[PDB]
């Protein structure tokens with residue numbers, strides 16, 4: 456039903472991804488070490504599709520200035536509360552223009568898969584290049600590629616916090632050149648009873664070559680790293696191709 | 697939504713109660729030892745609201761003849777497959793008449809709480825007495841009493857079998873003289889995706905005295921045993937009051 460990271464889905468986001476084991480503190484430390492490898496003097500970072508601003512909160516401990524861009528107002532509201540001294544823009548990775556550049560431009564946890572087709576992917580990569588300093592680095596965490604996607608995958612987990620029990624179950628299928636992921640939730644607590652929610656997303660299965668193509672078209676040199684924080688690896692790009 | 701143990705709810709019953717830890721083999725052994733305490737020569741047993749026939753399957757190893765009665769055709773279908781050599785009647789605990797008596801008449805796992813009011817409870821207890829041999833025993837596992845019910849209770853568990861993942865979440869609230877239990881399910885598998893189901897039941901909170909009253913009115917001597925297989929204790933009754 457929803458595909459827009461809104462309402463109760465946005466409110467549940469952080470608890471469910473923490474319950475699944477996601478460690479944004481570690482991921483931010485790793486990201487900052489990776490960035491400083493390619494740009495030793497790096498000072499500022501823009502996190503695109505920053506969601507609830509969990510990486511930004513931790514990256515602020517490593518970078519003098521951090522900033523975000525996010526499409527969903529409800530995600531953004533959470534992010535702004537968590538990062539009250541940073542600028543967080545409501546906008547679209549396909550066409551934003553902030554009039555400034557950063558040491559690092561990051562786009563994490565498969566947000567890039569919400570783009571449809573090579574044209575949107577190239578457009579986003581060009582915007583990321585349009586916002587990186589000449590000595591900086593772009594980091595994009597892809598969705599699954601066709602060559603590593605597992606169709607029929609079922610993930611189920613339950614987490615409890617503050618008196619509330621949340622179960623999240625996903626099923627991922629092949630829909631042409633994308634994954635269809637259906638996600639259902641049961642949210643329960645003594646005072647509120649049980650509520651059911653659902654999300655459904657089409658997330659594009661770009662090949663590695665297609666990602667590399669978008670980096671190249673944007674003037675970035677590209678390298679893929681397998682494994683990565685979420686099993687999908689990580690691409691890094693440097694201006695100067 | 698449903699309150700009638702039908703369709704997919706009936707199909708999910710055994711897997712969810714097994715995942716929650718219910719051991720019908722142990723409960724049947726205990727029940728047979730309890731019965732033989734009060735009726736050493738006991739030979740036959742009628743399980744009323746026998747559901748999917750899980751106690752009957754195991755009790756058949758202890759009693760020469762076992763038989764069941766169940767209101768829901770879909771539960772009964774499962775029970776009949778599991779117990780192909782026994783007679784399993786489609787009927788109602790409030791008014792059935794089988795024209796024969798048994799060494800033991802059992803009614804397990806709070807099925808008795810599906811009755812509304814003292815009149816139905818007394819009617820069922822009189823039917824149970826109308827089907828027990830003079831030297832036999834009646835065993836009724838109650839629902840919660842007002843004095844031991846915990847309102848706001850949330851139970852969540854996930855079990856996997858045969859490629860299918862099932863999450864069941866319940867919330868129990870006080871509705872006058874009953875509990876309102878709402879139960880939601882998520883059923884997931886690689887081939888079938890995710891489906892959501894729900895049940896809602898009103899289950900009467902009779903006091904211990906009200907149970908004892910129904911046994912007495914039916915000519916049975918009554919004893920309550922705390923704890924029991926499901927935390928609600930157990931009543932046993934003997935003809936001859």
Ligand SMILES: Cc1cn([C@H]2C[C@H](O)[C@@H](COP(=O)(O)OP(=O)(O)Oc3ccccc3)O2)c(=O)[nH]c1=O
Nearest residue numbers: 564565599603604605606608610625627636685686
């Ligand atoms: C398909 C798939 C999943 N997983 C692993 C990956 C993950 O550990 C788990 C699936 O969990 P779920 O909540 O559905 O997806 P995420 O955690 O990625 O969250 C997001 C969902 C959509 C957009 C972005 C992020 O199984 C794989 O290892 N291979 C696969 O092909």
Ligand SMILES: Cc1cn([C@H]2C[C@H](O)[C@@H](COP(=O)(O)OP(=O)(O)Oc3ccccc3)O2)c(=O)[nH]c1=O
Nearest residue numbers: 805806840844845846847849851866868877926927
């Ligand atoms: C209210 C309540 C529950 N529990 C325990 C009892 C149980 O271990 C758990 C609740 O699990 P759930 O699936 O909702 O109920 P059942 O397993 O009884 O199944 C049936 C439901 C309805 C009709 C018959 C049987 O919490 C308690 O200890 N006290 C309570 O007051």
Ligand SMILES: C[S@@+](CC[C@H](N)C(=O)[O-])C[C@H]1O[C@@H](n2cnc3c(N)ncnc32)[C@H](O)[C@@H]1O
Nearest residue numbers: 460504505506525526527547548563564566569
């Ligand atoms: C899986 S979440 C990842 C959020 C965050 N980066 C993290 O690691 O938790 C995907 C995010 O992409 C955002 N998003 C989707 N399409 C977008 C677009 N065109 N521009 C900006 N953000 C977008 C969603 O609103 C959501 O916050």
Ligand SMILES: C[S@@+](CC[C@H](N)C(=O)[O-])C[C@H]1O[C@@H](n2cnc3c(N)ncnc32)[C@H](O)[C@@H]1O
Nearest residue numbers: 701745746747766767768788789804805807810
């Ligand atoms: C919680 S289930 C217990 C089933 C079984 N005794 C067990 O231990 O698994 C409650 C059962 O009561 C049955 N039931 C409800 N009202 C009934 C009635 N009036 N007569 C007979 N069975 C009834 C339901 O159809 C269901 O099978």
